[PDB]
Amino acid sequence: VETFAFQAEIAQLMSLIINTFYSNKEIFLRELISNSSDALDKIRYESLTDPSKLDSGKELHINLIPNKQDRTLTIVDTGIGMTKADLINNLGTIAKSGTKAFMEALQAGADISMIGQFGVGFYSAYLVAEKVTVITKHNDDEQYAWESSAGGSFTVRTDTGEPMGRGTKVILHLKEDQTEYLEERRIKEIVKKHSQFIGYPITLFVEKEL
Numbered sequence: 001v002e003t004f005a006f007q008a009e010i011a012q013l014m015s016l017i018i019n020t021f022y023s024n025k026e027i028f029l030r031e032l033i034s035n036s037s038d039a040l041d042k043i044r045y046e047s048l049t050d051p052s053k054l055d056s057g058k059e060l061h062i063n064l065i066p067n068k069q070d071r072t073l074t075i076v077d078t079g080i081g082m083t084k085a086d087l088i089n090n091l092g093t094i095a096k097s098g099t100k101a102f103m104e105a106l107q108a109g110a111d112i113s114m115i116g117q118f119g120v121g122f123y124s125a126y127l128v129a130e131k132v133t134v135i136t137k138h139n140d141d142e143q144y145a146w147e148s149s150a151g152g153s154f155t156v157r158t159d160t161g162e163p164m165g166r167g168t169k170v171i172l173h174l175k176e177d178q179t180e181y182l183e184e185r186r187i188k189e190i191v192k193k194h195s196q197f198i199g200y201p202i203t204l205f206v207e208k209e210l
């Protein structure tokens with residue numbers, strides 16, 4: 001288990017998002033889905049010069065899996081995924097050029113759904129999630145898991161669970177008062193609102209253990 005610190009601006013934003021109120025916290029789903037689509041875009045781009053790269057899965061898509069038992073909403077894509085370095089760099093440690101700008105707009109009163117515009121729309125998941133786990137697998141590396149509950153740091157281990165062919169899985173351990181987003185009905189409407197121009201298939205798998 002490795003522990004890493006967040007780049008100071010990202011760490012600062014996370015604390016702003018967590019502690020500020022918005023009437024409007026569901027744009028986080030738009031964001032993780034946009035991310036997934038870009039990942040899909042990416043592996044698709046790579047495969048145009050090398051078919052073999054799709055030997056870890058020909059289908060390109062996004063699943064949504066609300067789990068009420070475990071109070072977790074999961075977003076899964078068979079996209080490009082991340083190598084270990086990719087994971088450590090892109091989910092906290094390297095400065096994103098839009099972080100400052102976005103914090104100023106928030107200051108000026110900008111609504112939170114602006115966040116997509118600044119390339120930091122992932123950290124919006126912490127509007128609804130006390131904890132986030134990202135499990136990723138890239139053709140060029142083994143499978144890893146990234147964890148953070150904010151508070152300045154994240155961790156990275158290898159993940160032993162169910163091997164993905166390829167892609168990324170963002171698991172949201174929801175806050176107590178954010179459980180409406182496990183509601184099938186709530187997820188139907190949200191996708192229909194913020195994600196009707198996503199060029200990949202999106203399926204809703206409702207998970208319940210017996």
Ligand SMILES: Nc1nc2c(c(-c3c(Cl)cc(Cl)cc3OCCCC(F)(F)F)n1)CN(C(=O)NC1CCC1)C2
Nearest residue numbers: 035036038039042077080081082086090091122134168
């Ligand atoms: N679903 C999903 N997949 C991926 C990523 C994210 C993501 C996360 Cl978890 C957190 C944040 Cl802050 C942003 C994110 O994405 C922004 C769009 C990235 C783009 F998709 F364009 F690659 N989310 C990141 N990834 C890589 O960096 N891959 C390396 C490119 C070489 C392999 C795959």
